[PDB]
Design a protein around this ligand. Sequence first.
Ligand SMILES: [Zn+2]
Length: 370
Amino acid sequence: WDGKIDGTGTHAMIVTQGVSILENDLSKNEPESVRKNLEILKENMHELQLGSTYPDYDKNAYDLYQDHFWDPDTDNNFSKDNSWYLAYSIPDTGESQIRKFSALARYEWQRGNYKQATFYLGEAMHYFGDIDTPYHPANVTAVDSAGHVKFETFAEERKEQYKINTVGCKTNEDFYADILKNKDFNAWSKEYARGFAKTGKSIYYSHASMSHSWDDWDYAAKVTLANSQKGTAGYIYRFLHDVSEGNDPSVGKNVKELVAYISTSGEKDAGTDDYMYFGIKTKDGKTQEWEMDNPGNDFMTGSKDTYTFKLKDENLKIDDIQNMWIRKRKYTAFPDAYKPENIKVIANGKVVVDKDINEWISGNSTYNIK
Ligand SMILES: [Zn+2]
């Protein structure tokens, strides 16, 4: 879906509708804290709207927006168009970004930073909205087909007539109740998103591609836009319950992957081109290290980078990881100083490390973040 940097456009309509829908379907026996948090959420509507359109204008966006894609069947963005990386990486997809930003959103909310929290939730919904288009889950880029942009423009112009005001049931009913059943946010979000993405991919082949009429496009937009609104409303519902009761999805679960969200200082020369590594040390003195290298230029001055690391051992708990750090090693003969501003480490949908740094890492040195 289209979206403008000022927080207007199809993307903004989906989240704005998502809140109204929720308000409409909210059952009377819904907890009081949920009602209050929704009021705080409506108070911050413009940040939800800005976050919903922001990823397309984010200056450190991938050249092709690879991560805005995800095939629910193959489980990747364009087969491996990021340009798949073995032994170190973990390419981001629309699906993983929903999880990343969802974790950031709950974290900020829990500390009363509603402004930042809502912006993050907004970004998470941008990615869900995308996977609910016909083209994104089918992995059909703008380069691959002219119908891609054309379809999103068709939708943008008619967005007003595709708004829905309810999912068709109250929150105490099946659709919403199901959302709350699985405490493992991550396992849930993946399946929930898969269902909508499969419907979008089907719609592409049966109605939204360039082989179809314009009465077909109307039907395709009506269905996928309705589903986008419906699914967003559910995500918001889940969010409100999670932030209101302080539900934690990481509990007891093994840590199979770690996600690092790094903000590089905006100061002159803060970015670097040297080899960067992220490492962990376990209580038992066992260590693992991965090279941080997604890319197209990582660690640019003022950028925000995401890395996902898969752990070797699969029986570890969060408390088992004694230390974590970042280490830099020179590329050429002269070290390239690096100045990170902050680093957050996410495990099982929970921000486990929120570390401000704001200092140079001049040469070949290690810097503990935990
Ligand atoms: Zn979009």
